[PDB]
């Protein structure tokens, strides 16, 4: 087995990805060619891609093909391709393996211009759109917006041309549900690639200064339950301290991190003082607990503290607050885990171990002593204990590190690591146990690497050097090892590393090119032929690479300043190693200050890009196959190994005053200069930008531009003021001068506010470096948006401070709901394609609180469609068994009418093209001849007998009436003859209790008929059967006495079905009742009984059917019992179809489609007819629910408002504000399917 190959490939193919497949062969000397091909699965017919590769000593018999799966070449449709054949073909070998494929190709980074938005805002939003290759994807993208209730609100589409998809601004609806909204992004047609972002909608006003609350520990232990100590600091959004603030502390019990509201204490509620930006506080938790808790001891509290702080600037008007719920009281507060450790051993090589200590609510503790105890085995299970070892954790990294000089012959190690903090006993000093295992070569053939796991990221463009040491009984054979460098899903470098005459091998001396960032994985492998049997030997290591951009893009203000003045014109420079696009945006730091723990949207970009990597762990493996699988590869080889041993386990180890502006995109032709004016606001603006090119993304460093002023006035205006009340609004002048000066304030306002202060002042002086309270008891008269201004005049200065006050009405913002289902076909009953909604006015409307009206619309989708259809045997079902005696003619033509009806689904006449068409004119002929035949079976009195002189039968009359209901589209029977038939039936055989007892024929017919009941309530069958036929004829002979006979028959059949007669009678009765009052309470009870009697397969039912009468006996051929089964199931089907219960029907259709009990029923005309009727009805129902509904909505006297093209592809248009005070009329074109339309009204009462 000297001649051997390895083909190595990603564990999973990404659709549309360019995948690099590498091949090595051994024991060959004649140069030869191979082809590596990606082929359809299982049939291998279509070839997606193919690569010819040539192998020779000129290539050291190594090569690669670049192969790709362009997404349109897949068949697509509802069933996407799960699997594809990878193939290799040569003169010497042919093999193929079933690769999995994935449609997850690339990255959709949603960036919203803020994380928080008020109502009455539009979001700016854009999406960065990148391939798996990290190039700008240039693909159509779609956004979907979900409210905090999980209700879809809007969808919008845009076409990428750049990698930067600047979607239209989303106007927040006129009445949003407050809370966490979500944006999802998808490539429209052909990828999963689902991006996500979150944003919060709330009534808020920007904080005027940050409060930062800084406990010394996220946990309280024995050392700090006696006394816990905490720092608080406060700083403006210009980076200067709060000079003085009054502080009120609050403490409380807590029992959950997630969601509890346990009681606050009423002790240590310390009113205290913050100076020079800082307050220092201490809580004696022991005494507070013992005083006011029911707890008295820490051992009762593996639980949490709540802490909150509020503060008010001691010489001003602004106030702020925050909290830190969840400081963990815990007896064992630490936890431990590995980081970057393999758990695989190279013997004799110093084996490194690293551990991270973490907390509950984990941070890097960094300060813990830890110690290690270990036991080993080398050979024949000689259990050998190691000497213990000790490290501190690193204070910054958290890492405690160890290295074990294990025996040169060690086979396994298992060990414990425990916290050695002398203050914690081992019941408290957190501890863990772990096992590592050797590579388990059969050939004792190994390939170790001289890698210490250098903790420090490799810098881009350095040469990595790794010496590599195969060790083997057969090293003389091992001419070269082969190496692969993989990044993310993809092999990016491959090569060969020759043995020197030193009996050692060329190291991997390679540049870490930019494509390797942030992480790459090195796998080295060889095949050694052994004595006769080949073995693939491999090892791999994760290589951490410096995070660096390919563009090296940099951005800076060219007129650099520590702080700029408001409105200052500035110049900005963008410089790059190559021509690039760049997006820019600016956002105020108070915005992020709004939300505790807010995230910068371009955070984690590299760690998110790393989620693309298919591997897990830091390297190594229990085996060659395990090494490749953990490396994220798979391989085809004859060298006695296969990756089918392993599976994709969930491996998860650890390794003007705007809010926003400058929201733009620009080209930078290697360099660009911009000139622009700053806003009038005072803050740190954070200016952030993202470079994009065919070289990929870069995120630039955030330029924090300060805008500042030494003397100014500010006002703590709340988000809205309730109309008609007066409130003392508070604020303060600030002096950051060395000296005090006199100031004066002369507030002015639009007449929408008139207030008794009537803003010659006190002309107070602020002290130097101090603030002075300013207050106004403004009393708003008029609702809405009103300009208020705080003009100020002062010694050596003036200031202007325009504002818009929002005034909101008194009372309660109550909401009310109304809506309907649009049903332009009457699937549920009354055709309902118009509705009207007057502008109704509540009797408790407050006189000025004009009612807000909002519209919403939903499409209702078909769901699962099960393509149950006839075989080509429809030819036979038409050409049916020879016409003749026993009314073989009747039994032949009776299916013809129903096959006709079935094809009058239309599809099957529109398309038979898999097979030669049924000739439509042949069908029409056959139908006509059928009508001619069926006339021959009418009795003179319009009863029916199969024999011309035979006994008249109500049974056959009802059958005829059913048939004659169908035919009328081509051949109506004269209504008089139908009326005569019905009249004769009802007038002779209506009865006082039960009905339609068969008149004069006790002799059954087998293939035309079906099993009667036992005499007990056998009338149920007759009543049901006759009812069915009558209802199918009733639309062509309405007669009030017949209606009365229906009502009677239904009453009797119901009253006789209440005792749950044997299930066939129940099923046929339920089918009869589904023709009647579909909402009759007892009908619905009988349906519930039918549903309880169903049989199913699978917990979610895949198949559903009914058995009775020991039909669980075997039947390999159709028979009376299989007939009973097929008919009773077809009746349950038709019942549920009349309830339109598609979701319940589906597993019935599937079970029918199987034809289990093969051949069907007894091949009666009954079972076959009723089955094909049910299948026809289903086929109809699917097209009925198919959504196409062009809604139009207009006011009554005022004009049209809006139109919705509600369609399967666009099933949900945005909600619309119903602005105008007129009656609203909504309607639709006839179209198809179902919708629901709502209007809701908000009124302040």
């Amino acid at each position: 087995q000297e001649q051997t190959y390895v083909i190595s490939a990603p564990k999973i193919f990404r659709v549309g990805a360019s995948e690099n497949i590498v091949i090595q062969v051994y024991g060959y000397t004649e140069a030869f060619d191979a082809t590596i091909s990606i082929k359809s699965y299982p049939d291998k017919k279509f070839s997606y891609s193919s690569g010819h590769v040539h192998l020779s000593s000129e290539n050291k018999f190594q090569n690669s093909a670049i192969l790709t799966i362009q997404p349109k070449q897949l068949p697509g449709g509802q069933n996407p391709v799960s699997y594809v054949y990878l193939e290799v073909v040569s003169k010497h070998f042919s093999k193929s393996k079933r690769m999995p494929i994935t449609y997850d190709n690339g990255f959709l980074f949603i960036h919203t211009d803020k994380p928080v938005y008020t109502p009455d805002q539009s979001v700016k939003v854009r999406v960065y759109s990148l391939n798996d290759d990290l190039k700008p994807a240039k693909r159509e993208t779609v956004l979907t917006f979900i409210d905090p209730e999980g209700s879809e609100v809007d969808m919008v589409e845009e076409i990428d041309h750049i990698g930067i998809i600047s979607f239209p601004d989303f106007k927040i609806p006129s009445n949003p549900r407050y809370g966490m909204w979500t944006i999802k992004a998808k490539y429209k047609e052909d990828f999963s690639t689902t991006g996500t972002a979150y944003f919060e909608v709330k009534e808020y006003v920007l904080p005027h200064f940050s409060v930062s609350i800084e406990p010394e520990y996220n946990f309280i232990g024995y050392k700090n339950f006696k006394n816990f100590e905490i720092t608080i600091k406060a700083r403006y959004f210009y980076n200067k301290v709060v000079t003085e603030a009054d502080v009120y502390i609050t403490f409380g019990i807590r029992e959950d991190l997630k969601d509890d509201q346990k009681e606050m204490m009423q002790t240590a509620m310390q009113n205290t003082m913050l100076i020079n930006g800082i307050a220092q506080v201490t809580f004696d938790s022991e005494t507070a607990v013992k005083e006011l808790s029911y707890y008295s001891l820490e051992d009762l509290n593996n639980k949490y503290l709540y802490i909150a702080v509020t503060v008010i600037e001691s010489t001003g008007g602004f106030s702020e607050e925050a909290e830190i719920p969840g400081i963990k009281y815990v007896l064992s507060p630490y936890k431990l885990n590995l980081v970057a450790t393999p758990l695989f051993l190279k013997p004799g090589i110093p084996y490194p171990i690293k551990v991270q200590v973490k907390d509950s609510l984990d941070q890097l503790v960094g300060g813990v002593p830890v110690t290690l105890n270990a036991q080993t085995i080398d050979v024949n299970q000689e259990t050998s204990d190691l000497d213990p070892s000790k490290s501190v954790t690193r204070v910054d990294d958290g890492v405690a590190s160890f290295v074990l000089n294990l025996p040169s012959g060690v086979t396994v190690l298992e060990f414990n690591v425990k916290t050695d903090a002398p203050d914690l006993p081992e019941e408290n000093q957190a501890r863990e146990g772990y096992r590592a295992i050797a590579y388990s070569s059969l050939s004792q053939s190994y390939l170790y690497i001289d890698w210490t796991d250098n903790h420090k990221a490799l810098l881009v463009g350095e040469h990595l050097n790794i010496i590599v040491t195969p060790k083997s009984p057969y090293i003389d054979k091992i001419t070269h090892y082969n190496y692969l460098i993989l990044s993310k899903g993809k092999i990016i470098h491959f090569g060969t590393r020759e043995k020197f005459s030193d009996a050692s091998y060329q190291s991997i001396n390679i540049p870490v090119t930019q494509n390797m960032v942030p992480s790459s994985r090195l796998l080295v492998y060889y095949i050694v032929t052994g004595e006769q049997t080949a073995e693939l030997v491999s090892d791999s290591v994760w290589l951490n690479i410096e995070e660096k951009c390919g563009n090296q893009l940099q951005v800076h203000l060219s007129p650099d300043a520590d702080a700029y003045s408001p409105g200052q014109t500035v110049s900005l420079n963008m410089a790059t190693g190559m021509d690039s696009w760049v997006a820019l945006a600016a956002v105020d730091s108070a915005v992020y200050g709004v939300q505790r723990g807010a995230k910068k949207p371009l955070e984690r970009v590299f760690q998110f890009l790393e989620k693309s990597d298919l591997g897990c762990g830091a390297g190594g493996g229990l085996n060659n196959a395990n090494v490749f699988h953990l490396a994220g590869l798979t391989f085809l080889t004859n060298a006695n190994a296969d990756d089918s041993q392993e599976n994709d386990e969930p491996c998860k180890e650890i390794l003007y005053f705007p809010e926003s502006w400058l929201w733009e995109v620009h080209l930078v032709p290697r360099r660009k200069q911009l000139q622009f004016a700053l806003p009038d606001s005072l803050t740190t603006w954070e200016i952030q930008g993202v470079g994009i090119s065919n070289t990929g993304i870069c995120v630039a460093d955030t330029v924090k531009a300060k805008v500042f002023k030494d003397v100014f006035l500010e006002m703590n205006i709340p988000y809205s003021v309730v109309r008609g009340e007066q409130i003392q609004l508070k604020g303060t002048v600030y002096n950051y001068r060395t000296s005090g000066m006199q100031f004066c304030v002369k507030m002015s306002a639009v007449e929408g506010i008139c207030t008794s202060e009537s803003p010659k002042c006190v002309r107070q002086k602020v002290e130097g470096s101090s603030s002075h309270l300013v207050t106004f008891t403004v009393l708003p008269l008029e609702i809405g948006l009103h300009n208020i201004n705080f003009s100020l005049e002062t010694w050596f200065g003036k200031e202007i401070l325009v504002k818009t006050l929002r005034v909101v009405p008194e009372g309660v913002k109550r909401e009310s709901y109304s809506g309907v289902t649009l049903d332009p076909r009457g699937i549920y009953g009354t055709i309902s394609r118009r509705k009207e909604f007057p502008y109704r006015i509540p009797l408790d409307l407050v006189p000025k609180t004009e009612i807000k009206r909002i519209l919403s619309v939903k499409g209702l989708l078909v769901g699962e469609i099960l393509s149950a259809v006839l075989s080509q045997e429809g030819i036979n079902i038409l050409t049916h068994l020879p016409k003749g005696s026993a009314e073989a003619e009747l039994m032949s033509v009776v299916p013809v009418f129903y096959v006709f009806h079935y094809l009058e689904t239309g599809n099957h006449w529109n398309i038979f093209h898999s097979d030669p068409l049924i000739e439509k004119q042949k069908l029409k002929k056959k139908l006509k001849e059928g009508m001619l035949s069926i006339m021959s079976y009418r009795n003179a009195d319009y009863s029916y007998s199969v024999w011309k002189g035979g006994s008249a039968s109500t049974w056959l009359t009802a059958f005829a009436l059913r048939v004659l209901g169908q035919v009328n589209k081509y051949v109506e029977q004269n209504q008089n003859s139908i009326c005569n038939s019905l009249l004769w039936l009802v007038e002779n055989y209506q009865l006082d209790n039960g009905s339609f007892k068969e008149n004069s024929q006790y002799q059954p017919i087998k293939l035309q008929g079906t099993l009667p009941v036992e005499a007990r309530e056998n009338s149920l069958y007759l009543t049901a059967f006759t009812v069915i036929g009558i209802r199918k004829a009733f639309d062509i002979c309405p007669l009030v006495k017949i209606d009365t006979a229906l009502i009677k028959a239904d009453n009797f059949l119901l009253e006789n079905t209440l005792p749950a007669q044997s299930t066939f009678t129940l099923a046929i009765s339920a089918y009869a009742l589904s023709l009647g009052d579909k909402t009759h309470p007892q009908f619905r009870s009988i349906v519930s009984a039918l549903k309880r009697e169903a049989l199913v397969k699978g917990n979610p039912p895949i198949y559903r059917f009914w058995k009775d009468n020991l039909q669980h006996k075997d039947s390999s051929v159709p028979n009376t019992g299989t007939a009973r089964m097929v008919e009773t199931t077809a009746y349950a089907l038709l019942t549920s179809l009349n309830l339109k219960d598609i979701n319940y029907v589906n597993p019935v259709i599937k079970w029918l489609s199987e034809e289990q009990r093969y051949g069907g029923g007894f091949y009666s005309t009954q079972d076959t007819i009723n089955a094909i009727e049910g299948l026809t009805e289903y086929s109809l129902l699917v097209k009925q629910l198919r959504l196409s509904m062009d809604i139009d909505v207009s006011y009554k006297h005022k004009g049209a408002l809006h139109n919705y093209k509600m369609t399967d592809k666009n099933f949900l248009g945005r909600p619309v504000e119903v602005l105008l005070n007129d009656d609203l009329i909504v309607s639709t074109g006839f179209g198809s399917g179902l919708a629901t339309v709502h209007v809701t009204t908000v009124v302040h009462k």
Binding site: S166, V665, L667
Partner: peptide, 27 residues
């Protein structure tokens, strides 16, 4: 210009005294 590159800003304005809706640039 006969065409406007994406993200570059045009300017459109009518003569004095006319009233005009919509933005001064379209993208």
């Amino acid at each position: 210009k006969p065409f406007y590159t994406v993200g570059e800003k045009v300017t459109v304005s009518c003569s004095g005294g006319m009233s005009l809706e919509g933005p001064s640039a379209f993208l």
